[PDB]
Amino acid sequence: LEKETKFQKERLSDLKHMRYRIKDDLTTIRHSVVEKQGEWHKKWKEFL
Amino acid sequence: AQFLQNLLLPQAKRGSLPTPHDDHFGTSYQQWLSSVETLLTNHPPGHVLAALEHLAAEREAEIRSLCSGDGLGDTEISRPQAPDQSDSSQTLPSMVHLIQEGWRTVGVLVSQRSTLLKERQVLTQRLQGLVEEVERRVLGSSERQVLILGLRRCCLWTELKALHDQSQELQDAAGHRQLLLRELQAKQQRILHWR
Amino acid sequence: RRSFAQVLELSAEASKEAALANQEVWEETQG
Amino acid sequence: TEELAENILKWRKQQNEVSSCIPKILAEESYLYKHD
Amino acid sequence: EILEERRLEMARLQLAYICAQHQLIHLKASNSSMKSSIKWAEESLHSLTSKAVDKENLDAKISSLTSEIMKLEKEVTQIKDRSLPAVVRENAQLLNMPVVKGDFDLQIAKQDYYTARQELVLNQLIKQKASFELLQLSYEIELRKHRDIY
Structure with missing residues (x-):
């Protein structure tokens, strides 16, 4: 569970960077x- | 109510000539007088009061039913629409989105031009080799002059035809644009008459 | 949702830039 | 989501490079037509 | 600032569209011309092997071809100065109605609702006036009855 949480926080970091x-x-x-x-x-x- | 509606029928909204409804002032009043005579003769004023209270409650509840239109979902409350306005509510693109679709069309035109570059440069060498073969064959000066003149004529006639075709196509586009514009101005006079 | 919003906006602006570049090049070459 | 991200950025860069490469192609075609 | 930017955005759509269709017109006209040049060069290279033009006939066809070239050139010149650019400029200046039709239709869809509901309010006032007039007329009839029996 804490692994998934770290991947989604890295994920949203990458999303804000690409934005x-x-x-x-x-x-x-x-x-x-x-x-x-x-x-x-x-x-x-x-x-003209 | 018909009498007052004829009183409050908008004279400027009447497309025909204004009709002075003094016949509706008189004959409808006489029919109303007969109905009121029957109404008063057969009935007491007390239950007249009761029924008038009932009809006042009916009118109040009729207004309350339209006041109770907040029963829908309170999520981004905007666009007060007509009662059951769903089919005619087409998703018209906004100020930006119409220009977005227009730029999509011009980008398709850009891709078409990019393909036009390859097509024109490939097929240019066919004409280049054809004129080179004209120069290669054993032909006289007058023959080559006729060849150049005919080559230019065959250029010019079909180029003029294509110019007519494209000019009339864009004039048809402008005609469709004005056929949309006539609806715009007619709707503008409709809004002015609404005011 | 806002990502789709700026994707559509940047698509409009990029096609706009392509149109401007093509118009400029046509005026450069053809005159 | 990020797949469409590199998809959109590759379309935008592709059309930009095409827009920049249209000059040489048009110059070559115009000078070929203007030369007999 | 946003309205100025959006009006500028429409003006820039017209700015691109002033030449955007004109590029396609010129490219297609040139392509039709060079296909016709290819077909005429092919046809004449095939024909000169079979048919030989006499020198007097060569000069006569020179005169005929050139006399048609002057008319074709003036008719093409008529469609490159003030006919094509004015038409494409009109088409660009007529890029407003996708916005204007929607902007009018939203307010008209609201205005039919305004007219219907305001006429409903008017009819409510009309019904109330009718009821009050009926009640007052009943009072007047009662007064007349009182005076007559008096």
């Missing part, structure tokens, strides 16, 4: 998306 790193990936992707859309909007505003 945080996919959140960081979300931030990086959103930053790139914002920069690309700023460039596109400026370029096509000058174009």
Whole structure:
């Protein structure tokens, strides 16, 4: 029983770690998306 | 109640011309007078009071039945819906989720473009070797000029046909978009008339 | 449940990024 | 749960590498078409 | 900030969609063109072995092919400047109604309920007014009876 308890606490630790790193990936992707859309909007505003 | 409903029938909500219901002021009143004459003649005011108390309790319990709608599960209480509104309650995607499905469609388009790269680069070499075989054969300058002109004509006619096909397809998409937009504006005037 | 929430959100944003990259490259090459 | 985790992250990295590799393919195809 | 971000999200969907379908249009048109080029190169490489064009006929077909190329080129040019980009821009600017139909339908599904329940309240007041009018009319009839017997 104490073995299962240690595996589920390590399990939830890994879950919170993967949540945080996919959140960081979300931030990086959103930053790139914002920069690309700023460039596109400026370029096509000058174009049209 | 029919008399007061004709009094409180909304004139602006009437699609036809407004009907001044003075015939409902008079003839319905006379029929009501006959019914009230029978009611008062056959019956005492005391059990009139008893039955009026009973009907006031009926109206109070009629309101109480709708007040007692909290018998459902008190878990995330939101969306006050119509009584038995289940079939028409389609799971419309939210502000984000519609854009999620749209980005799924554009990602499918991205995969289609990625396959288009491989297809176009593989089939490009067929035309390249075909024009190289045109150059390889023993043909005159005028023959090769006719070959180039016909190659360009066969490019242009079918490219123009494909341009028409894609332009009319996206114009049909815009037409379906406006066919959805007409429902939007009609529902907007419905909400304004509701106000 | 919240994990599915951010999975769908990041899927939308990643397909958005793919669309932006493809649009940028098409404007780079075709003009 | 973690199986779909590496599944989703491999799809996202795969499409990202494809998006980055579209430039060279399009440049090669456009320069092949623009050269007789 | 969240509403501004979501309006920007819709505007970015339009931003991508301004060229997203246009890429597919250009790619499919180019692919149809190069399939037709492949088929014409094949057909003419097969035909020139069997059929030999005379030099006067070579120049006549040069004139005919070129005269059709100018018309095909101007008709293609008509569908690359202000016809395709305006259509795709209209399609992008018409990416609103999936949101607007749901947002209108939720409030309308609530508004039919509002109309029905407010008309129920109105009919409750109407029934109460009817009962009070009946009771007052009975009182007036009793008063008239009292005066007449008096």
